[PDB]
Design a protein around this ligand. Structure first.
Ligand SMILES: *[C@@H]1O[C@H](CO[C@@H]2O[C@@H](C)[C@@H](O)[C@@H](O)[C@@H]2O)[C@@H](O[C@@H]2O[C@H](CO)[C@@H](O[C@@H]3O[C@H](CO[C@H]4O[C@H](CO)[C@@H](O)[C@H](O)[C@@H]4O)[C@@H](O)[C@H](O[C@H]4O[C@H](CO)[C@@H](O)[C@H](O)[C@@H]4O)[C@@H]3O)[C@H](O)[C@H]2NC(C)=O)[C@H](O)[C@H]1NC(C)=O
Ligand SMILES: *[C@@H]1O[C@H](CO[C@@H]2O[C@@H](C)[C@@H](O)[C@@H](O)[C@@H]2O)[C@@H](O[C@@H]2O[C@H](CO)[C@@H](O[C@@H]3O[C@H](CO[C@H]4O[C@H](CO)[C@@H](O)[C@H](O)[C@@H]4O)[C@@H](O)[C@H](O[C@H]4O[C@H](CO)[C@@H](O)[C@H](O)[C@@H]4O)[C@@H]3O)[C@H](O)[C@H]2NC(C)=O)[C@H](O)[C@H]1NC(C)=O
Ligand SMILES: *[C@@H]1O[C@H](CO)[C@@H](O[C@@H]2O[C@H](CO)[C@@H](O[C@@H]3O[C@H](CO[C@H]4O[C@H](CO)[C@@H](O)[C@H](O)[C@@H]4O)[C@@H](O)[C@H](O[C@H]4O[C@H](CO)[C@@H](O)[C@H](O)[C@@H]4O)[C@@H]3O)[C@H](O)[C@H]2NC(C)=O)[C@H](O)[C@H]1NC(C)=O
Ligand SMILES: *[C@@H]1O[C@H](CO)[C@@H](O[C@@H]2O[C@H](CO)[C@@H](O[C@@H]3O[C@H](CO[C@H]4O[C@H](CO)[C@@H](O)[C@H](O)[C@@H]4O)[C@@H](O)[C@H](O[C@H]4O[C@H](CO)[C@@H](O)[C@H](O)[C@@H]4O)[C@@H]3O)[C@H](O)[C@H]2NC(C)=O)[C@H](O)[C@H]1NC(C)=O
Ligand SMILES: *[C@@H]1O[C@H](CO)[C@@H](O[C@@H]2O[C@H](CO)[C@@H](O[C@@H]3O[C@H](CO[C@H]4O[C@H](CO)[C@@H](O)[C@H](O)[C@@H]4O)[C@@H](O)[C@H](O[C@H]4O[C@H](CO)[C@@H](O)[C@H](O)[C@@H]4O)[C@@H]3O)[C@H](O)[C@H]2NC(C)=O)[C@H](O)[C@H]1NC(C)=O
Ligand SMILES: *[C@@H]1O[C@H](CO)[C@@H](O[C@@H]2O[C@H](CO)[C@@H](O[C@@H]3O[C@H](CO[C@H]4O[C@H](CO)[C@@H](O)[C@H](O)[C@@H]4O)[C@@H](O)[C@H](O[C@H]4O[C@H](CO)[C@@H](O)[C@H](O)[C@@H]4O)[C@@H]3O)[C@H](O)[C@H]2NC(C)=O)[C@H](O)[C@H]1NC(C)=O
Ligand SMILES: *[C@@H]1O[C@H](CO)[C@@H](O)[C@H](O)[C@H]1NC(C)=O
Ligand SMILES: *[C@@H]1O[C@H](CO)[C@@H](O)[C@H](O)[C@H]1NC(C)=O
Ligand SMILES: [Ca+2]
Ligand SMILES: [Ca+2]
Ligand SMILES: [Cl-]
Ligand SMILES: [Cl-]
Lengths: 417, 417
């Protein structure tokens, strides 16, 4: 680890390591259902400086970068004295939802998502995630005043061990005031019966995993007095930069996340692991199956030992369990005359040449029998002794014994006296 | 030997035996160069009853069975009070030879050939034999008055050990008187430097061997006084039955000689021997090579032991000598999974099933390996132990050991704890 490498310890040998925690939103462009712009639109702010509840109406023009509120302002530079704010059309209302989506383009373990509003917080909204890259969409958290009516939800009920992957519906962070600067923040891991036990809880690891994330504002609040109608008065969504705090899901096997040949984000997978999330593991590491890392056991994939005599290999769960969870990895395409599980013994008509280690290419000489002197071409595949005929000693059977005279006739090449 | 069998002794086991000694001429038709017949011919006899040297001339007519002298009379019923006589034309003279031939149609060891004449004996003649059935002809004995002139022969010279197969030329049995009843008789084995040692002398065994036999009368005697010319006076050949005493050559391996499927004479070969003369030996008796019989060692051919697992086999002279003259006979087409010289051990991918004797058909079980449990299909071919993989005991490798747990995965079917 002669630079930063947290993945390998000071022995040299591997442990567990995580990519750095980030705002995965900054610089990354957000898709929206409703920007005011075309047409240029009325909007009003009711502002209580002093104690005076004053109405100030303005011009929402996406053609003018001084009056424009594009989705760019959701992931620009945050600076709360100088709030840059995306803004929607007015009184898009229940049933009609404004949605926003952010695609990460990579599985992230989500810690939180925060939305800072320069408008009132929604009366009713919901957050959604995608496990796949935007195909199915999965509920995450609901924020309705009337859960039973709106989302067919119990209001602030139980999370059990059976359904820890459960969105609660909660009349909270759904207050009208603050009229400006209100926070939505959802944290994934609150309220789970293994909240503590995240390294060791797979159901929670899946919960927080997501590729794309989607916010849905489903209703607004109307203040409910006689004003004089103003049209669509001041009822719109607007947010002054967003954050999605998360870590790049590499299952504890990778150092940092990097841009690809294909200009996609992937894990720089370290521990003989493979794929985008390091969620399978590398070819010819199929001795011992895939598992997520922890500090306890780094749990990583390890090479099939085929002795330099094979390149393709596969796992066997059966052999893994009957090896006592040590090894299930068996070799195919056995080269250099080798055979059996680990390409470990010489195939028939070769015997093991012990003068040479197994990793040596000629680890296995041919039986090399004298065809006349041998009663068989296949030798015993470890002793290398070809079976000789009546008194034809020698490994290759290339020689008469003492007491046996040589002939030239090949059916009877040695004979007694 | 529940009938005559001299070939097998009272143990049951074989010794040496010979066919009976015969006149091989009787009943068998003789080929000739000169019969008087057509035309009917003059012939005279000069006969000294009392003391009177009287000339009696007669009529030689093959159309009249009372005056006919056909070659039939060379091998008819002998009865010297009643002489039946074949007769030639008169004064066929040097250079002109009358020849006779007798084909036996079977190799015979000749003892003697006797010709009894009712005429004077030839001044000059010769006997010939055929080793092959009448192709080459080989000289045998010469009977000239002037050997040097007639046959380019020394008169009564030496027989050496280098040329025991040598016809002598001998002015003997070449006397004019007897004018009637004279004998030619040639005995083969006279005068040989291993005359005694016939069972043990191969060069003499070849000498006396013959298939066809040929007599050649090359000159006559003329009495040389002034008579009154008589024409062709009385100068002809005539013989009153012939004999060829011999034994049917079966090289001491056969009981008697018998007529074939093809109506040819052959040896009834007994001692696992084969051919006409028993002069090779039978298929699948090529352990230990062919040899003639004697009383000393019957020397006979003996079966290749291929253990009921082969039918074709061959000899090896090299293996015979290095077996110490015991066995040179090796097996081909090894059935029932057997292998090696005598089809004696199990071929690769079978091992020897000792529960069963070698002559049993299933003397050799398949390795019969458990294909999953074995690291090899070929077992050690006597132990029958297929090479099992990591802790898969058993001969067929059909079982995990104690301390090894069974899997269903075929690359790792047993595993420790
Ligand atoms: C939050 O607001 C979102 C916007 O909607 C507004 O507010 C709501 C309350 C209503 O008053 C509505 O009228 C307003 O406009 C709202 O999202 C919308 O939700 C509806 C219902 O879930 C979606 O409708 C369905 O659309 C699909 C097709 O559209 C999709 O695919 C096409 C491509 O083919 C895409 O281009 C679209 O973008 C979509 O992705 C229909 O197939 C489906 O039909 C169903 O209903 C009909 C009868 O109407 C039946 O006969 C059928 O069998 C089906 O059952 C729906 O019509 C709508 O797509 C979605 N719009 C947008 C723009 O995302 C969200 O639901 C609001 N939340 C709540 C809780 O109200
Ligand atoms: C015992 O008498 C036998 C009969 O002969 C009579 O007496 C002799 C002395 C002469 O006076 C003769 O003229 C009398 O008729 C005698 O047998 C004969 O021997 C001769 C010489 O060895 C044989 O001659 C050779 O014949 C072959 C071909 O004939 C053979 O094959 C045919 C088939 O193609 C058959 O049908 C025949 O039956 C034969 O089997 C010739 O190729 C060969 O030619 C050679 O000589 C010429 C010149 O003349 C050369 O140019 C060549 O290059 C050759 O060298 C011979 O002519 C004859 O076949 C044979 N006849 C019979 C009926 O068997 C025997 O030799 C007398 N014994 C002694 C010691 O005199
Ligand atoms: C919403 O946001 C938009 C900003 O994008 C505001 O638009 C401005 O509106 C004023 C209205 O008076 C525009 O001013 C007038 O434009 C007339 C036409 O000018 C056009 O073409 C010239 C070039 O040929 C451009 O430079 C100009 O931008 C326009 O596109 C002029 O006839 C007027 O002239 C008078 O004032 C000028 C001041 O420079 C004097 O020089 C002249 O002599 C004369 O007295 C006048 O300029 C202004 O152009 C718009 N600005 C921009 C940045 O687009 C909307 O007004 C705003 N509010 C609402 C309620 O919608
Ligand atoms: C090449 O091929 C040959 C044969 O084809 C193999 O050799 C045979 O090897 C086995 C085991 O290697 C020999 O014997 C058997 O050993 C069993 C285990 O004990 C051994 O190992 C333990 C430690 O693990 C030692 O403490 C112990 O001393 C042994 O060395 C025994 O359980 C067996 O005994 C049983 O059978 C015998 C008869 O065989 C009975 O009499 C007993 O009562 C008991 O029931 C057994 O002794 C075996 O004998 C070898 N063969 C021959 C012919 O002698 C090579 O090992 C093989 N190698 C390869 C890799 O291919
Ligand atoms: C050599 O050997 C042959 C033997 O094969 C002798 O041949 C005999 O020769 C005599 C000569 O006189 C033959 O006899 C005469 O044959 C004449 C013709 O007959 C032929 O046809 C009849 C049937 O039609 C046959 O049966 C017969 O065999 C002949 O083929 C006759 O005209 C003669 O007839 C006279 O005698 C007979 C005897 O029976 C009387 O009945 C008649 O009336 C008449 O008087 C006479 O028969 C004789 O046939 C031959 N015999 C045989 C067995 O063939 C040679 O003679 C002998 N010698 C010499 C020197 O060559
Ligand atoms: C199946 O396959 C296995 C192995 O593939 C064979 O088993 C091996 O068999 C050999 C011989 O059968 C074992 O050992 C060697 O034996 C030599 C001969 O001695 C044996 O036989 C004589 C009688 O003929 C006995 O008196 C004697 O006690 C032995 O039983 C020794 O000369 C060898 O010793 C030499 O090598 C050793 C090291 O191996 C040295 O330390 C010595 O100094 C010396 O130089 C040797 O001991 C051999 O060990 C077996 N294998 C294993 C792994 O143990 C089966 O026989 C075979 N069968 C068939 C038919 O296929
Ligand atoms: C930001 O600061 C400037 C002075 O530098 C001030 O004129 C401006 O009105 C401020 N903007 C907001 C939106 O508070
Ligand atoms: C044979 O015997 C008979 C009498 O039975 C006699 O007439 C005949 O002449 C004899 N033949 C010879 C050739 O001696
Ligand atoms: Ca901002
Ligand atoms: Ca006669
Ligand atoms: Cl290589
Ligand atoms: Cl069979």
């Amino acid at each position: 680890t002669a630079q930063p490498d947290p993945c390998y310890d000071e022995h040299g040998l591997p442990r567990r390591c995580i990519p750095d925690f980030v705002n995965s939103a900054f610089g990354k462009e957000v898709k929206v259902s409703s920007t005011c712009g075309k047409p240029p639109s009325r909007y009003c702010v009711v502002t209580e400086k002093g104690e005076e509840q004053v109405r100030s109406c303005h011009l929402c023009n996406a053609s003018d970068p001084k009056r424009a509120h594009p989705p760019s302002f959701l992931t620009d530079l945050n600076n709360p004295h100088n709030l840059t704010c995306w803004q929607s059309d007015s009184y898009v209302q229940y049933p009609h939802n404004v949605t926003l989506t952010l695609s990460l383009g990579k599985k992230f373990e989500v810690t939180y998502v925060s939305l800072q509003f320069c408008s009132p917080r929604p009366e009713s909204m919901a957050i959604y995630k995608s496990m796949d890259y935007g195909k199915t969409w999965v509920p995450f958290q609901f924020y309705s005043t009337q859960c039973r009516k709106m989302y067919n939800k119990p209001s602030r009920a139980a999370i059990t061990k059976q359904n820890e992957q459960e969105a609660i519906c909660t009349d909270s962070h759904t207050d009208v005031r603050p009229l400006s600067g209100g926070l939505i923040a959802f944290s994934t891991l609150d309220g789970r019966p293994t909240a503590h036990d995240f390294d060791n809880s797979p159901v929670l690891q899946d919960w927080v995993t997501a590729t794309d994330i989607k916010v849905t504002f489903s209703r607004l609040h109307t203040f409910g007095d006689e004003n004089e109608d103003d049209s669509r008065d001041s009822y719109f969504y607007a947010v002054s930069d967003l954050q999605v705090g998360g870590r790049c899901k590499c299952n504890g096997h990778a150092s940092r996340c990097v841009r690809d040949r294909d200009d996609n984000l992937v894990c720089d997978c370290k521990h003989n692991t493979a794929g985008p999330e390091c969620d399978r593991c590398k070819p010819f590491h199929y001795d011992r199956p895939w598992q997520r890392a922890t500090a306890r056991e780094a749990n990583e994939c390890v090479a099939c030992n085929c002795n330099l005599h094979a390149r393709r290999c596969r796992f066997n769960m059966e052999l893994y369990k009957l090896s006592g969870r040590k090894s299930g990895g068996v070799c195919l395409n056995c080269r250099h005359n080798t055979a059996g599980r680990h390409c470990h013994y010489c195939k028939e008509g070769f015997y093991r040449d012990l003068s040479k280690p197994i990793s040596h290419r000629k680890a296995c000489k041919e039986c090399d029998c004298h065809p006349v002197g041998a009663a068989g071409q296949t030798c015993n595949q470890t002793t290398g002794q070809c079976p000789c005929k009546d008194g034809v000693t020698g490994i290759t059977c290339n020689r008469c014994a003492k007491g046996y005279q040589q002939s030239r006739s090949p059916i009877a090449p040695c004979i007694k006296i």
